[PDB]
Structures are given as C-alpha cells and as structure tokens.
Write a protein that binds this ligand. Sequence first.
Ligand SMILES: Cc1cc2nc3c(=O)[nH]c(=O)nc-3n(C[C@H](O)[C@H](O)[C@H](O)COP(=O)(O)O)c2cc1C
Ligand SMILES: CC(=O)Nc1ccc([C@H](O)C2CCCCC2)cc1
Ligand SMILES: O=C(O)c1cc(=O)[nH]c(=O)[nH]1
Ligand SMILES: [Cl-]
Ligand SMILES: [Cl-]
Length: 363
Amino acid sequence: GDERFYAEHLMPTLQGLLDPESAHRLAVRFTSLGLLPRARFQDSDMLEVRVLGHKFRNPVGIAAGFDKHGEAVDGLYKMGFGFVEIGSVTPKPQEGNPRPRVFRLPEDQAVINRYGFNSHGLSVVEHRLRARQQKQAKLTEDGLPLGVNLGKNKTSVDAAEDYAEGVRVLGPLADYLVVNVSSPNTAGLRSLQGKAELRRLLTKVLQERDGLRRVHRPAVLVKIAPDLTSQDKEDIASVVKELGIDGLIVTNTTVSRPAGLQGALRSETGGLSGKPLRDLSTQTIREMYALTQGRVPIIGVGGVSSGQDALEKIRAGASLVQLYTALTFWGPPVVGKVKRELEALLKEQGFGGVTDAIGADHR
Ligand SMILES: Cc1cc2nc3c(=O)[nH]c(=O)nc-3n(C[C@H](O)[C@H](O)[C@H](O)COP(=O)(O)O)c2cc1C
Ligand SMILES: CC(=O)Nc1ccc([C@H](O)C2CCCCC2)cc1
Ligand SMILES: O=C(O)c1cc(=O)[nH]c(=O)[nH]1
Ligand SMILES: [Cl-]
Ligand SMILES: [Cl-]
C-alpha cells in the first residue's frame, strides 16, 4: 500500500523533478520537521539487541551520510530506525567537493557519491546535539541510541588530532563514536586503515575517549572499506583486538565498479552504494567476524533493502545493520518493510530473536 505509492508514483516523480543532492536536502528538511507520518510498525521483543553497552529496540539504523549535521535525528527515530548515526562531522566547517557530486544509477539500485565531507563542523553539531541532549538520554534509555561519525578536514596535517578533537567535542553527546577511515573521497584517508597508521590513530582516540567522565564515555567503532586486501583485513582485526576497539562498521562505499553495472553514470568518480555493494559488504562482515572470533560487535551496512538482506548480514556476523541508499529508491516505507520481513524470516528459520541469529552461519 504505502510501499507501492512511494516506489511506483511519488519517488519517480521526485527523481524526475529534482537532482539527487536537491532531493537529499529536501528529505533532510522534511524529516527534521516531522512532516512524514509516524511509523505504524510496533517493534516486537525479538528485534531487541543488547550490544555496545546499550539496548537497541530494533537492529535497523540509518547509516552515516543521510544526516551529516545532526539536523533530523528525531524525525529519523519517528521513521522507525532503532538507532541513528549522524555525520561524518569534520572539526572545522568545510564545503566538500564541487557539484555535481551525487549520482543515481536506477538500473542498478545504486548511488555514486563524491561529497568529500561537506560538514557544518564540530561546534555547530555540538550545539545542535546539546539543544536536544536530555531528549536523547531518554531515547537511549528507551532503546534508541545515537552514534556520531567523525571525519577529517581536507587541509589538516595531523589526522589523529582531527579525530581526537571529534572525541573531545562530540564523544560526550554520543552513545557510540565512529572513526571513519574508509571514505573514498578524501585524499589519503584510506591509508589510515594500514596497520601502523591505524594503531597510532586508534591509540590516540581511545586515550581521548578514556579521558571522558564515565557517564559521558562512548563506545569507539572503526568504519572500514569494502575494498581491503586480505592483509589489510587481518591487520585491522589484530589492531582492534590488541587495543580493545568496541566494534566495527562494515562497510563504507566501494571504489570498485562491479561487472554488470548498467547506469549511464557508472564511471563517475566516487563511492558506490546500494545493491551492487551488498554481497561484497556481507562477505567483508563474514571475514571480519571470523578474524575477530565473534568477540567484536559488527554493524553491517551495504545494499540492505529487505529483511533477507538484513538477516544475511546478521547471520554473517552483524549485531546491527544500517541502510541509506534503499531510502533513495523505496522511500520511508523501506524501514518498516525491512523489520517486518526480518521478524518473519527469524521465525521461519527457528530463531527466538535477532541475538540468536548473530553469526549463525559460522556455527
Ligand atoms: C550520499 C552518501 C553520503 C555518505 N556519507 C557518508 C559519511 O559522511 N560518512 C560515512 O562514514 N559514510 C557515509 N556513506 C556511506 C554509508 O554510511 C554506507 O556505509 C554505504 O552507503 C553503504 O550502505 P547503503 O548501501 O545502504 O547506502 C555515505 C553514502 C552515501 C550514498
Ligand atoms: C541522496 C539522497 O539522500 N536521496 C534521497 C532521496 C529521497 C529521500 C526520501 O525517501 C524522500 C521522502 C519523501 C520526501 C522526499 C524525500 C531520501 C534520500
Ligand atoms: O562525504 C563523502 O563523500 C563520503 C564519506 C564516506 O565516508 N563515504 C562516502 O561514500 N562518501
Ligand atoms: Cl586516495
Ligand atoms: Cl588480496
């Protein structure tokens, strides 16, 4: 009903009128004001997950990039997301790359983007989170946590110091922090996933984090690329277990262009998201879960647009999942649809809940 109206009528009209960045800006604006109707789906108890020192009412979150600046957090919970990740946020304000910088590939159910960390900056985001801070403390207690994804300024010399600044400013306002070292659109950023660079970076991050007061102390997760060599992945797993990193977000967008893409804009520079990323992302979750012996919580992200997609990542090793690109094609009804189908699939496969399904393929 509502799924068909968005998918077949409203979204093709929106795509026909507005460029993808303009449509994104309108989506953030409409979501922030609460103009969308409240999600009718009540989450069952079997969707509840306990991870990262928090209850999650459902395991389906909004991935970083949709709400870069912390403008639409409450509207995103109203849509039925079990958790919200804002960002990436850089220390100073910066504009990002020149337009055009977002591209639809509707034949692939994919997006390519090269935003380049457009960000209002830490100070603006700080004050915005402060204004609704006690509302968030209640939401978190009710099972609706907030993640903050940290990035690096384009012109910064010391990358670790950009991330350190992010921990000090927004760590107190977050349930979890994400060290994004996997954007394909900032020069040299993915080099930070290498063993020695990563160990130095995360030592400094965890130290800054441990210096926060206990009640204001977030979990620290590392967000990784889907384009890593076997050597890179094994090295990340090692660094993560050595330092006691709280989790992994698996994965960012891909710089690959899989055989079979049909979209006219497939050769645009940027990160590819959506359906062509999906199995590449699931396999990365599979490998990272095995290398970490199932002891490091994974948030699974990349081409989730259904209950099956979510459950494949969960079973591969993900404790929670995120989606973004699916929202650009199917609209807000995708959130309810993913959760409803997940719940049905868990019952069909003999799982009492999400928790029982996590890493089930490895057993
Ligand atoms: C327009 C756009 C902007 C994004 N911005 C960010 C970002 O700022 N930080 C980040 O860590 N990931 C970012 N991502 C990556 C997503 O969070 C996610 O990892 C990826 O798109 C795979 O999920 P999906 O297939 O559901 O989109 C962005 C993705 C898109 C499509
Ligand atoms: C790149 C990007 O972010 N594109 C995007 C496009 C559409 C939407 C929303 O589904 C749509 C809901 C109803 C109001 C219009 C916006 C979200 C993201
Ligand atoms: O801002 C961006 O360009 C961006 C960041 C990121 O982490 N991932 C992505 O696909 N785009
Ligand atoms: Cl590079
Ligand atoms: Cl390899």
